Amino acid sequence: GSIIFLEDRAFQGRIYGCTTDCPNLQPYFSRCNSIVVQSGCWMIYERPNYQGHQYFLRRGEYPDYQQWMGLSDSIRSCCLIPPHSGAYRMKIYDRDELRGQMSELTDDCLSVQDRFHLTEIHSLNVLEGSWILYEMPNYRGRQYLLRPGEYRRFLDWGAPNAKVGSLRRVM
């Protein structure tokens, strides 16, 4: 994995590269307005120690922070999402604490509404693989990284509420 952070838009100014997880990028740059992801799947963060708004980035060029649907030029931490072989799987619930109706998901989902007839997911259990949860359909809006494990409440993935629009396997 290799991600390159660059100070200004259209890839100009100082460039700084990371081949692995970094809890605080603040000592290396005061802002980031474009990024080149050479390899790997990455989640970058607005604040140090993986806090704040999250953003998912895959191989490719990002000429401005809006390219990764960012909200500002502040990126202070990043992590390389661990590769994964095999299948992906998770169960979603319409109640918290893994209560309510359960649904199986083993592939991508552009519209939680269409697939599950749900506007909100109050709890879920990621069994295999890493995923990205989006507040809006078609992988838009606020993003939250999901690692294998239990998520008993929407607080567990960091969202302000239980509204969920789409789910994407990280690959």
Swiss-Prot record:
Residues 1-39, 40-82, 88-128, 129-171 form the Beta/gamma crystallin 'Greek key' domain. The gene is CRYGB. InterPro entries: Beta/Gamma-Crystallin, Beta/gamma_crystallin, G_crystallin-like. It holds the Pfam family Crystall. Has a two-domain beta-structure, folded into four very similar Greek key motifs. GO terms for molecular function: structural constituent of eye lens. Gene3D superfamilies: Crystallins. Belongs to the beta/gamma-crystallin family. The keyword Aminoacyl-tRNA synthetase does not apply. This is Gamma-crystallin B. GO terms for biological process: lens development in camera-type eye; lens fiber cell morphogenesis; visual perception. Crystallins are the dominant structural components of the vertebrate eye lens. It comes from Homo sapiens.
